[PDB]
Amino acid sequence: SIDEQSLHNARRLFESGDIDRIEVGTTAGLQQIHRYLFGGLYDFAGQIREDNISKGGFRFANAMYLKEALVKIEQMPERTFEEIIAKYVEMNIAHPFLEGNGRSTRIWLDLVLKKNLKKVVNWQNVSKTLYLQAMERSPVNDLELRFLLKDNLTDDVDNREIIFKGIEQSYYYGGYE
Amino acid sequence: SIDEQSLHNARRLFESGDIDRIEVGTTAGLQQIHRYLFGGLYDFAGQIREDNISKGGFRFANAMYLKEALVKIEQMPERTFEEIIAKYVEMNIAHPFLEGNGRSTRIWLDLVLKKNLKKVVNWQNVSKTLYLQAMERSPVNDLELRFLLKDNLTDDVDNREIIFKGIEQSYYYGGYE
Numbered sequence: 001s002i003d004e005q006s007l008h009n010a011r012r013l014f015e016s017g018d019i020d021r022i023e024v025g026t027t028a029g030l031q032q033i034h035r036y037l038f039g040g041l042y043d044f045a046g047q048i049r050e051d052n053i054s055k056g057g058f059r060f061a062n063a064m065y066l067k068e069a070l071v072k073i074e075q076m077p078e079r080t081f082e083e084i085i086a087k088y089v090e091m092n093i094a095h096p097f098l099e100g101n102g103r104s105t106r107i108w109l110d111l112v113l114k115k116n117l118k119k120v121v122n123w124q125n126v127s128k129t130l131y132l133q134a135m136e137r138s139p140v141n142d143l144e145l146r147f148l149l150k151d152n153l154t155d156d157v158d159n160r161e162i163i164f165k166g167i168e169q170s171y172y173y174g175g176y177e
Numbered sequence: 178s179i180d181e182q183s184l185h186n187a188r189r190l191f192e193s194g195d196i197d198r199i200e201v202g203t204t205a206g207l208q209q210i211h212r213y214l215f216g217g218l219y220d221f222a223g224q225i226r227e228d229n230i231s232k233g234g235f236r237f238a239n240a241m242y243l244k245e246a247l248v249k250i251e252q253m254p255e256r257t258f259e260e261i262i263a264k265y266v267e268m269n270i271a272h273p274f275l276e277g278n279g280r281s282t283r284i285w286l287d288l289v290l291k292k293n294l295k296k297v298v299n300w301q302n303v304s305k306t307l308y309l310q311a312m313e314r315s316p317v318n319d320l321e322l323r324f325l326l327k328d329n330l331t332d333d334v335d336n337r338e339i340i341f342k343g344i345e346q347s348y349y350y351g352g353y354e
């Protein structure tokens with residue numbers, strides 16, 4: 001039900017045009033996204049975590065230096081696809097919230113791609129299994145992730161079907177329907 | 178041959194008493210150890226790396242925020258075995274040099290244990306296979322490492338056989354003889 005309400009928030013972010021007022025490629029902008037999706041649902045919406053977390057055998061950036069890491073991550077360049085993916089990979093390693101990192105940071109990635117390349121990821125055609133494998137591998141080698149995403153870019157960045165079917169797939173990655 | 182010369186340096190560190198002049202539990206003290214073992218052998222002896230490195234599927238702390246991470250890691254408490262191991266685990270995640278992290282940081286760990294608990298690890302009885310597995314797991318859960326090391330502590334901290342057979346085993350962990 002938390003997931004269902006945040007899915008409505010995600011849809012409203014785009015329907016309302018509020019997506020166009022989110023700061024692009026910064027820590028604050030990621031926090032804006034997270035606050036929009038999870039405000040009133042998670043107590044920690046928008047807030048940088050103070051606890052440590054791991055998933056599938058990988059420990060995300062230690063909370064004691066997470067703030068410092070985010071200051072450096074947000075300054076990374078965004079000129080090319082390769083640089084943008086590298087920045088995304090580091091933001092994923094940071095994993096700045098207790099929950100909802102995946103959904104918020106994918107929206108954050110699309111904004112950076114859209115601003116710098118005039119493209120976004122056509123998530124509806126990006127397999128859950130291949131996406132999750134590629135993300136798990138990305139800290140060591142982002143080849144899997146680059147191969148996957150580059151083949152699924154679209155320049156039709158405001159198309160309703162791409163946007164809304166993409167949001168649905170994004171939520172599916174986290175286990176919702 | 179680099180390994181053989183640094184093994185002589187490691188032995189001399191203890192034989193000479195120079196070990197007693199190394200700063201305990203700090204980043205600078207780890208750099209002193211590394212400089213002592215590898216000075217004149219690696220160009221980067223004592224120097225915090227600027228490149229990224231991974232091993233066995235784990236990416237060590239990103240070079241762009243490594244300095245910041247080390248400032249926080251060195252401030253971690255050292256009062257109990259559990260705290261000391263937690264500090265060691267984070268220093269291993271930092272992996273501040275291009276090479277020689279294992280050998281230098283194990284000496285660094287013994288100094289912290291010796292200062293705070295009046296014990297050191299009896300490395301000669303600590304299996305290579307179990308040690309390397311336990312270190313690989315430690316970022317997610319340090320249970321393996323704690324179980325292994327706690328069973329192999331000794332209060333005979335200046336005993337020549339414990340020290341020199343321990344150095345030999347430490348070098349063996351890295352693949353030397």
Ligand SMILES: Nc1ncnc2c1ncn2[C@@H]1O[C@H](COP(=O)(O)OP(=O)(O)NP(=O)(O)O)[C@@H](O)[C@H]1O
Pocket residue numbers: 055056057058092097098099100101102103104131132135136137170171172173174175
């Ligand atoms: N072992 C791992 N290493 C690196 N990244 C991972 C790992 N496991 C999961 N991830 C990423 O972390 C994200 C999940 O973080 P989480 O805070 O659960 O976000 P979410 O929005 O709640 N769920 P999701 O829809 O899966 O992104 C996923 O998008 C994965 O790509």
Ligand SMILES: Nc1ncnc2c1ncn2[C@@H]1O[C@H](COP(=O)(O)OP(=O)(O)NP(=O)(O)O)[C@@H](O)[C@H]1O
Pocket residue numbers: 232233234235269274275276277278279280281308309312313314347348349350351352
């Ligand atoms: N996948 C991993 N995750 C976490 N730590 C690891 C991993 N692989 C190796 N290590 C640790 O990293 C150390 C090796 O770092 P390195 O810079 O090669 O030091 P070294 O002194 O040259 N060799 P060693 O004698 O094995 O410690 C080892 O002591 C391991 O315990």
Ligand SMILES: [Mg+2]
Pocket residue numbers: 099100101174
């Ligand atoms: Mg989640």
Ligand SMILES: [Mg+2]
Pocket residue numbers: 276277278351
């Ligand atoms: Mg080595």
